[PDB]
Design a protein around this nucleic acid. Structure first.
Lengths: 66, 148, 38, 94, 141
RNA sequence: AGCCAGGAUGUUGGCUUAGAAGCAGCCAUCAUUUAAAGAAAGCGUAAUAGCUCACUGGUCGAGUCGGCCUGCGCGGAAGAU
């Protein structure tokens, strides 16, 4: 989550798993499922929805040039 | 470590406990944990506090350097690992007792309790002790003698 | 193993050994620290 | 307290001075008082270890030059331009 | 206790022993019973006080049920509700910010008499010095 | 130097962090209990956990540690009939 240019915000330890809470950019979550699986032996749901817009890191920004 | 100016204090202090003491016990702390000391310090605790010690020193070279003073019955204790215990006030007391009861809770060996000095001799757990103030065992020896 | 010209201990467990004509470094904890051509 | 044995210099000049220094000696000079100056040659490693203590430069100190005890103070030192060694010393007569 | 076996201490709360987001499940799930810390804890809760920090150890092997133990509060924390400020800096401790109650530190430490090594209860104070020079907050002694 | 032991209590110091529990950073680095044991020299951890060190007790039984200056050597060092 951190590697994915992400900010973390909480942990519960909800019963058996451990819900982890984070704000992580869209252009960076692509194909999460695939790897989240690899990291947790297949045992790991996840979910996401829109939250906000924040500044894009420069190398990102100057890349995003049409 | 420290030079002599410090190997001398561990002497002049520790030997004026013998010169000004009461009872002596014994014990070899191979496996001496720290829950070990913790406890026995509360025991020294009950047994006043800091009236007691155990200063590991069995370097013959140390807590025998306090022996050709008094208790030369200890040229024979001092070999191998040892934990010397001195009494200042208190009865020739219970100090004796829990060392056997302690180490008989596994709490490591007791040197087979090579024993020590009140008399000038060796081993054998005695509660010939802290009855002390059991002069009541000579109060009950009154009315019962007067009556019976 | 790394080869290098300057070799030197890395971990506290790296050891330095002169086998044949060549100076070496052996680490019992961390394979990455092996060194030769010293 | 510093006792420095020494010998009067039999040779002077750039030539000798260098020679001395090849043999772990090193020249120095005592001057001061109303009497003439004196050309000394000192054992190097000794003065080195001595001058390691700061007292060397403060205390009065004594030089036993052919059995006399001249008793002087360190005025000036010449250290090697890039080594840990001494080149020369000025001693003031006290 | 002459033999440790399993202990995890995550300061709970008295007034209702029934968490869920903080601890809840994670306090009892490996041979431990969530049903019995509201049958048993609260049996040792109301005799004293309720609401504030409770570290704790329990006696669970793999034996189904268990028996609950008690403990003691953190010591630099008795410098919150038992001193003043509740953080500890605000100006990172490049600045010596805090402020002390010399009267307190003995009897407020003494409240932690059952978990300290000093024979001299005054000694148990001298420990609280550094515990309370934890920022560099001077005591108006 | 080996080998046996211990290597602890305030306490996850404080701050800061999603988490900094001896050990990412910042400031502090005291006080206990002691034979000795750093508010920690390294491994480790998501963080704890876990393994070591410093230090002291035991064993052993006479030498031993590491800087300064200098002589001679070692690596560094691959080329074409």
């Amino acid at each position: 989550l951190s590697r994915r240019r992400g900010m973390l915000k909480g942990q519960e330890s909800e019963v058996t798993g451990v819900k982890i809470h984070a704000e992580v950019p869209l252009s960076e979550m692509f194909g999460y499922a695939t790897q989240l699986r690899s990291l947790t032996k297949g045992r790991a749901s996840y979910t996401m929805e829109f939250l906000k817009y924040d500044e894009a890191p420069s190398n990102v920004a100057q890349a995003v040039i049409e | 470590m420290a030079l002599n100016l410090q190997d001398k204090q561990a002497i002049v202090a520790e030997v004026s406990e013998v010169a000004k003491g009461a009872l002596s016990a014994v014990v070899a702390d191979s496996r001496g944990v720290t829950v070990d000391k913790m406890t026995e310090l509360r025991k020294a605790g009950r047994e006043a506090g800091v009236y007691m010690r155990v200063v590991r020193n069995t370097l013959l070279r140390r807590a025998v350097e306090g022996t050709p003073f008094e208790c030369l019955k200890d040229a024979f204790v001092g070999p191998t690992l040892i934990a010397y215990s001195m009494e200042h006030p208190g009865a020739a007391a219970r100090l004796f007792k829990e060392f056997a009861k302690a180490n008989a809770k596994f709490e490591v060996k007791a040197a087979a309790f090579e024993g020590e000095l009140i008399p000038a001799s060796q081993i054998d757990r005695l509660a010939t002790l802290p009855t002390y103030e059991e002069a009541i065992a000579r109060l009950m020896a009154t009315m019962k003698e007067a009556s019976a | 193993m790394k080869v290098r010209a300057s070799v030197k201990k890395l971990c506290r467990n790296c050891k330095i050994v002169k086998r044949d004509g060549v100076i070496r470094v052996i680490c019992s904890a961390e394979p990455k620290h092996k060194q030769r051509q010293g | 307290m510093f006792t420095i044995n020494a010998e009067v210099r039999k040779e002077q000049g750039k030539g000798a001075s260098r020679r001395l220094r090849a043999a772990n000696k090193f020249p120095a000079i005592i001057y001061g008082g109303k009497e003439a100056p004196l050309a000394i040659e000192l054992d190097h490693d000794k003065v080195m270890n001595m001058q390691a203590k700061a007292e060397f430069y403060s205390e009065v100190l004594t030089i036993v030059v052919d059995g006399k005890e001249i008793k002087v103070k360190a005025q000036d030192v010449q250290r090697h331009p890039y080594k840990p060694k001494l080149q020369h010393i000025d001693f003031v007569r006290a | 206790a002459k033999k440790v076996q399993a202990y995890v201490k995550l300061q709970v709360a008295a007034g209702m022993a029934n968490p869920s987001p903080p601890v809840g499940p994670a306090l009892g799930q490996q041979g431990v019973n969530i049903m019995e810390f509201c049958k048993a804890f609260n049996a040792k809760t109301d005799s004293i006080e309720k609401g504030l920090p409770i570290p704790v150890v329990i006696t669970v092997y793999a034996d189904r049920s268990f028996t609950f133990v008690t403990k003691t509060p953190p010591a630099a924390v008795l410098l919150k509700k038992a001193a003043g400020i509740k953080s500890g800096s605000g100006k990172p401790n490049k600045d010596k910010v805090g402020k002390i109650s010399r009267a307190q530190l003995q009897e407020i430490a003494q409240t932690k008499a059952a978990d300290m090594t000093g024979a001299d209860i005054e000694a148990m104070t001298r420990s609280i010095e550094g515990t309370a020079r934890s920022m560099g907050l001077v005591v108006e002694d």
